[PDB]
Amino acid sequence: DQKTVHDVTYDLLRKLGLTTVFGNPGSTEESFLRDFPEDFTYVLSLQEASALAMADGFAQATGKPALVNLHTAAGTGNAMGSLVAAYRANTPLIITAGQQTREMSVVDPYLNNPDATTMPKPWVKWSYEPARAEDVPAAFMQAYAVAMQPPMGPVFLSIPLDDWDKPALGPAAVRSVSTRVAPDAERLAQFAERINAAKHPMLVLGPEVDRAGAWDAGIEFAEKLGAPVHASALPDRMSFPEDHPLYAGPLPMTIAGVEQAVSAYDLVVVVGAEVFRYYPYVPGEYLPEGTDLLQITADPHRSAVAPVGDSLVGDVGIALSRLTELIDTPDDRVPPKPLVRQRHSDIPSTAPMTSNAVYEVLSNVKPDDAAVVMESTSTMLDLFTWLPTTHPASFFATGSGGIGWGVPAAVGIALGDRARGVDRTVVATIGDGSFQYSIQAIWTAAQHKLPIVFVVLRNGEYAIPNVPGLQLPGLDISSIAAGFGCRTATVESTDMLEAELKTALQADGPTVLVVPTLP
Amino acid sequence: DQKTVHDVTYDLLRKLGLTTVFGNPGSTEESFLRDFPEDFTYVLSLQEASALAMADGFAQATGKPALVNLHTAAGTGNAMGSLVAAYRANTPLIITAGQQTREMSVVDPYLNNPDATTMPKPWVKWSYEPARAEDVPAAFMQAYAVAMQPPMGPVFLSIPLDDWDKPALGPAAVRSVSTRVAPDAERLAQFAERINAAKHPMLVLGPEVDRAGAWDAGIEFAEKLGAPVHASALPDRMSFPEDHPLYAGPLPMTIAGVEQAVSAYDLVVVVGAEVFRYYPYVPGEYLPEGTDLLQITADPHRSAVAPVGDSLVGDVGIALSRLTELIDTPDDRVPPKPLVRQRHSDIPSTAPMTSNAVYEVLSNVKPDDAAVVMESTSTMLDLFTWLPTTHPASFFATGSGGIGWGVPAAVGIALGDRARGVDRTVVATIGDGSFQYSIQAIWTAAQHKLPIVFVVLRNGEYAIPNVPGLQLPGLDISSIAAGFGCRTATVESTDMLEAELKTALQADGPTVLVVPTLP
Amino acid sequence: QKTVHDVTYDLLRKLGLTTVFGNPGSTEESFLRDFPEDFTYVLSLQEASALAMADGFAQATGKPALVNLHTAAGTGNAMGSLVAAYRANTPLIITAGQQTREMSVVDPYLNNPDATTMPKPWVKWSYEPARAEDVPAAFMQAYAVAMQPPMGPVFLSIPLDDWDKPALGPAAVRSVSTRVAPDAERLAQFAERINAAKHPMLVLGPEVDRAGAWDAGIEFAEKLGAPVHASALPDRMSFPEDHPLYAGPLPMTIAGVEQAVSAYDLVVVVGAEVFRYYPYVPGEYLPEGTDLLQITADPHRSAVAPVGDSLVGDVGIALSRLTELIDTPDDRVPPKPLVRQRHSDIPSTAPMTSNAVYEVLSNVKPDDAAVVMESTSTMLDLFTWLPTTHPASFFATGSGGIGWGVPAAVGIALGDRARGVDRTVVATIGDGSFQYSIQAIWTAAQHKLPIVFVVLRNGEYPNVPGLQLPGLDISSIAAGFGCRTATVESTDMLEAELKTALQADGPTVLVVPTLPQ
Ligand SMILES: [Mg+2]
Ligand SMILES: [Mg+2]
Ligand SMILES: [Mg+2]
């Protein structure tokens, strides 16, 4: 009748709010999952890359940590790609895996996970296997503490399967931690003074802003400062309304490009974005002479690696509210030149159509409060042109740039919306290559009847001389989708796209719309 | 006109025989894959877990190392589960990933893979990123050297994308290494003396024997010794003919079970198997009093972790041939009690049928020289009963116990058979849960028109109190298979199974046969 | 025309990293070549001493310091000191030479393969640049990582051919946050919880002194009016031990601390671990009815706490702000000042008790001296006779590992001299501890540092082997390394030799025969 480690750990998890587990069960996790409490929810994915990316989307949508459970070394390993994405997104995930029993692990038995704590390195804030069964509950509290303290991120706990049935020491202590630190006030005041002195400042608001819930504070600061506001290149979140008069669009993604974009300004203020998220290499100066840079981030790693600038560490939400109070109202600052999207319509059109046609049709039917998930690199321009983000927490893309994230993340986001009482649709625009990586995640969408519309752009190739492995012939994506239980159609025209979109928006459960598009 | 690192590295790869690359291409790998030589082959998989497991099967079937190419941290991470399997199988894989350019990596740009060498740890023999572009070719030679020296295993090389276009130092030196070491002759002679002295010896021949090409040598030794011959529990390879009069079947998979199985013997000789591959925990003595143990393995890690016994390190093929010469012909050794399979027939039967029905139908139609790939844990007894392995290199299962291996490994094995000029069919029996993990691999089978028959046992659940996540409703596996380009049928009876099997064996290209079976 | 070497030293000068501690070897030659005239190289005879000396120098100056070590071998020799620097949150930039990129692929002699793994898990960051041209930016990055809170050591491995390559241009000079502030809203909740307490108790730990928050701590403590404990096993002391609210160090066991807090309804832990336990004696971490708040600059220390609600933030900022936030408590009947049981063993002949030794010390110790302590067995005597009354005036090993105090004392004195603080360092070191890093006293002699090493000689560190230290003439060893020395025969002679040592130029080693205990 004594409480076991299992009893008191689930009791702690409930108090912490960790009542949803994403995973794929195996033998080494049976003692953990056995007698799963009735008020907890287990979300099954067919493959671990999907489980962890789903948890990532869930955690991001709920603004709360999520628990993942993986099958020893094999399952942990399958999730390592999604782990990089979660780590780059600063998502508070508690990743657990079963481990062989302490009674046999010394002989390295079948499905042992030797040196388990090394495996997820270097992509976790913390990796741990308790020295004894009795500390499993405190280890969970600690995992939550590490994950949730800034900057947030995933952690790993390996638990020998025999631990769970051991007598507990007693109830687990329930702790709470700082999820924010504030900027040093004296340094923040120094930054404000430098900002007041600028003649031609520019403001960059990156993904940390939306993740801090600081959308409104960013707007209030941006409007007082009166400067043009850029977003991050290659954003995994969007943190400032893209229809705002001050919006100047995403930064370029190269050194030379950013150099040229900032050369008009005497000061760049970067809040919640890296300095800078560069992708392809085009040589230049990180910062052109005559342009100074300030950086504000909650992640000391991001200020540490910055090639240039003066930085400070602090929650970006606190920083923005405070900066608003500290800066002067500029004297007659000249309104930035409005951002103009080169829109032209390719509607109507028959399949195969341009990606430009596809995104315009989407913008005509997309509900105003829908969330957009993006995983189609060849079509970023189309998303920018036709689907501006105008609400907080309504745009998501891979934290790392690795694909196979958006499909399971969409399932996680919709599960998250349902848990937090938000009624909206998730629209995911995914390339056909990207769609294949974690295609099995759509089964979970169908199983939970999630309002997700997956719009798959089928052009028969990957989004990239004589390079092998780019072509994707011989895929009937509708059959696969139907096979996994999703509603589906292959669209023949912009009219059919529009009509199927309207039907999908009203359906119970997810739909996969396959849209043939041009290469 | 000067040779680049790219020129001379592919020249070296060709000389080494590394002319097939398994992977999934990305931006950070473009400079590697560009101008891919015409006589090389690129095998595309839709997801990295599949790419690496496919390479694993290819390498095992060809008896030669294979090259894998993965997309920076994201792609490396997606493959980590299959990496554990390859590492546990001692498969010589050279795993490479692209890395961000040396011109920008210091600022941790998008898709950088910081501390890349730590990531695949602890599941590689060696992990390396060259200190300069010019050493890339020597680093490949070294990767091959480490992978190929005993015990074989996978290695990891991370290559900054800018390296490939740098001027080479000159042609790369071509080296060759030992792929075997021999047992210390004086210690092996000591072991032979101990064997001569046994009154009731037993012999265990594990997966290293088949991987060493030592099938015949194992038979010759086993026949001279006259002892019963067990196989490994949970075998990833089978190394001794299962229809042999001396065959006593696989060992049990628990401590108590093995204890009881070996207690009749005064000496257990374990060649090329772990001591012992235990799975579930049932307490006992590793070795009962009165029973001694000798262990011979090419992997010092396996002798190091053994709880009991005297061991020696050496190639198992060399050891077996030599032991044959060293041991006495036993005087009138009593023939072991024959192994009797509890066969009873459930043919004919309508769907859903017993797994016993399914495997008997398979045994009636399976070509004698077919390879079997196994990934259906709830049906190991059926495989044992109806599909004995009677040829070398004709049985394969996951190295680690992690599922999602057999489907892509089957594709790799068939590609391997085609490369090495062996004409045979691969029959893969896969559970429905297992089939989902790396389901996209079947697209590669269809793209290369491989003679693979995937027999999927659909019982609606995973092969395992109150445990969540075991049920798999709402999957139409035929639609998915057809969607990926494979021939397919859903069988309704043993008659239909037999007929579809015969049709599949004659088809060009793979077939997925979905067989409804009982829970 | 400018090389990587040129622009890196230029950047280091601008960062203030102008003193280098180490012992140079072949693989460092290219780094140290043409060492600029305005930089200072402090040589130690062994690497453990070099890093611990850099630790003390950085703690004393309140600035980062650079350490340069000889490839795998030299880095390895310093790993024990690295643990101490890492536990103390000292911002040290540790560099080591590496074999040339031209050869390292063949694993040549003195190569350091997988260099970045070696100092793990005891650095915040470990790195070997992907190319020569990134070396200057790597140094800026190392500074950034070490200096951002919580501070700590980092490791850079530099292939020896990198230094002579052409630089890309001047290195960008960046500045970073060295503090974050508490979340104001969370701090305000903590303040409310403090106001609601009937009988709170305050713990002030080593972070407070490292943040220069001695005054803020006094101000807050005096307004709250609660008893004030210090950390067990302190590496710094942050609150005057002659203050009327001072209750002494916490016990060092679970059962002990459980008992110590049981009178209080709320424990407020600022800049101390929760809690620094050493021997195991079982209990509950907190008794029922006692709650705990924890404020630390190190997220690791809040993460591992077994109990409590915590927040992360600079402890100086938190203290100053808490003072403004809490109520003025009413009806103050103040806790009575701590009464130490003091009974003299003076005068006395050697071998004397440590009780005698410390009282003699208290009689002659300059009021503004720094104490460096490494004698676990005599902590009670230090508490009894040598209370810490000024900020930044007590130092002991960050980790618990011995061999730290001697080199640290050398670095502290060099740091005082660098920052223009005129004071004496008094180090009280057991005779076993004095041996680990005894070569460090050579650097003290070489730089003529005002350090008085008081070595408590009792011939030991049961039944456990390896505890006996016979056949050591420490006085002759010290003189051999160039230090003034004396073996004292009585309290009178101890006192006399102390006065001479405090007046002498350069360090003195006083060997004091003490009774075992
Ligand atoms: Mg495409
Ligand atoms: Mg099944
Ligand atoms: Mg002593």
Same CATH fold assignment for domains C1-176 and C340-517: yes
Alpha carbon of residue C364 to chain centroid: 25
User: Terminus-to-terminus CA distance in chain C, angstroms?
Assistant: 65
How many angstroms away from the CA of C172 is the closest CA of chain B? 13
Task: State the Cα torsion C230-C234-C240-C241 to the nearest 10°.
Answer: 70
Breaks in chain A (C–N > 2.5 Å) following residue: 464
Q: 10 Å Cβ neighbour count for B407? A: 31
Q: Which of B457, B378, B444 is nearest to B409 (CA)?
A: B444
List the one residue out of C351, C338, C274 whose CA is nearest residue C305: C274
C-alpha span between B91 and C332 (Å, rounded): 76
* Neighbour count for residue B476 (Cβ, 10 Å): 18
3-state secondary structure of C126: strand
**C-alpha to C-alpha distance for B510 and B318, rounded to whole angstroms:** 38
Rounded CA-CA distance A79/A91 in Å is 15
Q: Which CATH number does the domain A341-519 belong to among 3.40.50.970, 3.40.50.450, 3.90.245.10, 3.40.47.10?
A: 3.40.50.970
Helix (H, G, I), strand (E, B) or coil at C494: helix
Question: A178-340 has which fold?
Answer: Rossmann fold (3.40.50)
- Identity of the residue in B115, B117, B139 whose CB atom sits nearest the CB atom of C105: B139
CA A201 to chain centre: 29
Residues with CB under 5 A from ligand 2 (ion): B 431-433, 459
Contacts of B1 (CB under 8 A, 6+ apart): none
* A438 alpha carbon – ligand 2 mean position (Å): 20
CA distances for B517 relative to B354, B356, B384, angstroms: 6, 10, 18
Residue A236, class by beta-carbon neighbours within 10 Å (0-12 exposed, 13-18 middle, 19+ buried)?
buried
CA-closest candidate to residue B72, choices C369, A398, A306, C395? A398
Judging contacts by C-beta atoms under 8 Å, the chain B residues touching residue A462 are 25
In whole angstroms, give the CA distance from residue C443 to residue C57.
13
Cα–Cα distance for residue pair C404/C251, rounded to 1 Å: 23
Cα gap A169→A167, rounded to integer Å: 7
Alpha helices in C135-183 (DSSP H): 135-147
CA of B459 to the centre of ligand 2 (A): 5
Burial-class residue B289 by CB neighbours within 10 Å (0-12, 13-18, 19+). Answer: exposed
- The whole-angstrom separation of Cα A215 and Cα A231 is 12
Q: E strands of A335-468, at which residues? A: 371-375, 395-397, 426-431, 452-458
Q: What angle is formed at CA A269 by the lines to CA A267 and CA A271, rounded to 5 degrees?
A: 170
For residue B25 the two structure tokens come to 């291409």
Angle, CA of A163, A168 and A169, to the nearest 5°: 130
- Characterize B233-246 residue by residue with b for buried, 16 or more Cβ atoms within 10 angstroms of its Cβ, and e for exposed: bbbbbbbbbbeeeb
Residues of A in contact with C176 (CB under 8 A): 303-304, 310-313
Of C178, C174, C127, nearest to C151 by C-alpha is C178
Cα dist from A195 to A231, A292, B143, B408, whole Å: 19, 10, 53, 57
Joined tokens for residue A373: 């998930």
What sign does the CA torsion over A148, A154, A155, A160 have? positive
C393, HSE (Cβ side, Cα atoms, 13 Å): 20
Q: Tell me phi and psi for residue C473, to 5 degrees.
A: -105, 85
Give the C-alpha separation, B61 to A376, whole Å.
37
- Is A146–C303 a contact, with Cβ atoms under 8 angstroms apart? yes
Token readout for B369 is 């020289």
Q: What CATH code is assigned to C340-517? A: 3.40.50.970
Residue C195 CB partners (closer than 8 Å, separation 6+): C326, C327
- Enumerate the H helices of A290-365 as residue ranges: 300-305, 316-326, 355-365
DSSP assignment letter at B328: P
CA separation for the pair C202, C227 (Å, rounded) = 6
DSSP H helices in B151-284: 185-197, 207-211, 215-225, 255-262
Q: Among residues B177, B233, B226, B178, which one has the least CA distance to residue B207?
A: B233
CA B351 to chain CA mean position, Å = 32
Token output for A285: 């100066």
In this complex, do C129 and B106 lie within 8 Å of one another by their Cβ atoms? Answer: yes
Superfamily of domain C177-339: TPP-binding domain (3.40.50.1220)
Task: Please tell me the distance from the alpha carbon of residue A311 to that of residue C148, in angstroms, as a whole number.
Answer: 10
Distance from CA of residue A421 to its chain's centroid?
20
Distance B463 CA to ligand 2 centre (A): 6
- For chain B, what percentages of helix, strand and coil (3-state, to nearest 5) are there? 35, 20, 45
Distance (Å, rounded) from C-alpha C394 to C-alpha A422? 57
Provide the H-helix boundaries in C97-175: 135-147
**Position B330, amino acid:** P
Q: Give the type of residue at B114.
A: P
The answer to whether A461 is a known ligand-binding residue is: yes
* Chain CA centroid to CA A426, Å: 14
Contacts of B273 (CB under 8 A, 6+ apart): B204, B205, B206, B207, B208, B231, B232, B251, B297
CB-based contact B140:B12 (threshold 8 Å):
yes
Write out the two tokens for C264.
Answer: 């209080």
The amino acid at residue B53 is A
**Measured CA angle at B467 (ends B462, B473), to 5 deg:** 45
- CB-based burial of residue A186 (10 Å sphere; 0-12 exposed, 13-18 middle, 19+ buried)? exposed
Is residue B78 within 8 A of residue A50, CB to CB? The reply is no
Report how far residue B101's alpha carbon sits from residue B133's, in angstroms, rounded to the nearest whole number.
11
Decide if A408 contacts A352 (C-beta within 8 A). Answer: no
- Among C144, C303, C314, beta carbon nearest to A145: C303
Determine the Cα–Cα distance for residues A403 and A442; give it in Å rounded to an integer: 15
Q: Which fold has domain B1-177?
A: Rossmann fold (3.40.50)
Rg of chain A taking only CA atoms, in angstroms: 24
C400, with CB counted inside 10 A (0-12, 13-18, 19+), is: middle
Instruction: Please tell me whether residue B314 adopts helix, strand or coil conformation.
Output: coil
Q: Minimal Cα distance from A288: which residue of C? A: C172
Task: Provide the 3-class DSSP secondary structure of residue B139.
Answer: helix
Q: Which residues pair with A466 in a beta bridge?
A: none
What number of residues does chain A have?
519
Quick one: three-class SS letters along A465-517?
CCCCCCECCCCCHHHHHHHCCCEEEECCEHHHHHHHHHHHHHCCCCEEEEEEE
Tokens standing for residue B75: 């792609």
Identify the DSSP state of C468: B
Handedness of CA A258, A259, A262, A268 (dihedral sign): positive
Cα–Cα distances in angstroms (integers) from residue C415 to residues B435, C64, C78, C421, C425, in the given order:
67, 11, 20, 8, 11
Between CA A425 and CA A453 the distance in angstroms is 8
CATH pick for C1-176 out of 3.20.20.20, 3.40.50.300, 3.30.420.110, 3.40.50.970: 3.40.50.970
Nearest to B102 among C130, C137, C141 (CB): C130
Spacing of C-alpha B91 from chain mean position: 7
Label the pairing between strands C180-182 and A181-183: antiparallel
B78 close to A398: Cβ distance less than 8 angstroms: no
- Alpha-carbon distance of A181 to A322, in angstroms, equals 13
- Compute the distance between CA of residue B482 and CA of residue A264 in angstroms, rounded to an integer: 56
**In the block, which residue shows the tokens 């390592």?**
A80
Task: Please give the span between the terminal C-alpha atoms of chain A, in angstroms, as a whole number.
Answer: 66
Burial A480-510 (b: 16+ CB within 10 A, else e): bbbbbbbbbbbbebbebbbebbeebbeeebb
* CA dihedral for A316, A322, A324, A330, sign (positive or negative): negative
Angle CA B239–B243–B249, to nearest 5: 65
* Spatial CB neighbours of C189, under 8 Å, sequence gap ≥ 6: none
SS3 content of chain A, % helix, strand, coil (to 5): 35, 20, 45
What would you report as the CA-atom Rg of chain C, rounded to the nearest whole angstrom? 24
Calculate ∠ Cα B199-B203-B207, nearest 5°.
170
Cα–Cα distance for residue pair B426/B434, rounded to 1 Å: 17
- Cβ contact, residue pair C303, A150, below 8 Å: no
- Amino acid symbol at C48: A
**Domain edges within chain A:** 1-177, 178-340, 341-519
Give dist(CA A46, CA A27) in Å, integer. 16
The Cα–Cα gap between A221 and C125 comes to 34
Residue matched to tokens 């005002």: C450
Neighbours of chain A (3+ CB pairs under 8 A): B, C
For residue A510, is the peptide bond before it cis, meaning its omega torsion is within 30 degrees of 0?
A: no
Q: What is the C-alpha separation between B164 and B155, in angstroms, rounded?
A: 20
Q: HEC string of C66-107?
A: EEEECHHHHHHHCHHHHHHHHHCCCCEEEEEEECCCCCHHHC
- Considering only CB atoms, which chain A residues are within 8 Å of B462? 25
Structure tokens at C351: 């071998």
Q: Please give the DSSP secondary-structure letter assigned to residue C203.
A: E
Q: Which ligand is nearest to the CA of B475?
A: 2
The two three-digit tokens of residue B322, written as one number: 């030599």
d(CA C156, CA C123): 10
Q: What is d(CA A301, CA A317) in angstroms, rounded to the nearest whole number?
A: 18
Give the whole-angstrom CA distance, residue B184 versus residue B190. 10
CB A58 within 8 A of CB B64: no
Tell the burial category of C331 from Cβ atoms under 10 Å away from its Cβ (0-12, 13-18, 19+): exposed
E strand or H helix at C16: none
Question: Which residue of B78, B115, B303 is the best one to mutate when testing the A interface, meaning the one whose CB has the most A CBs within 10 A?
Answer: B78
Contact list in A for residue B81 (CB cut-off 8 A) is 48, 73-80
The whole-angstrom separation of Cα C303 and Cα C296 is 10
Q: Which residues contact A305 (CB under 8 A, 6 or more apart)?
A: B106, B107, B108, C141
Q: Between C117, C131, C141, which is nearest B102 by CB?
A: C131
Residue type at position A322: R
Query: What are residue A457's DSSP bridge partners?
Result: A431, A515
Query: H-type helices in A226-353, by residue range?
Result: 255-262, 300-305, 316-326
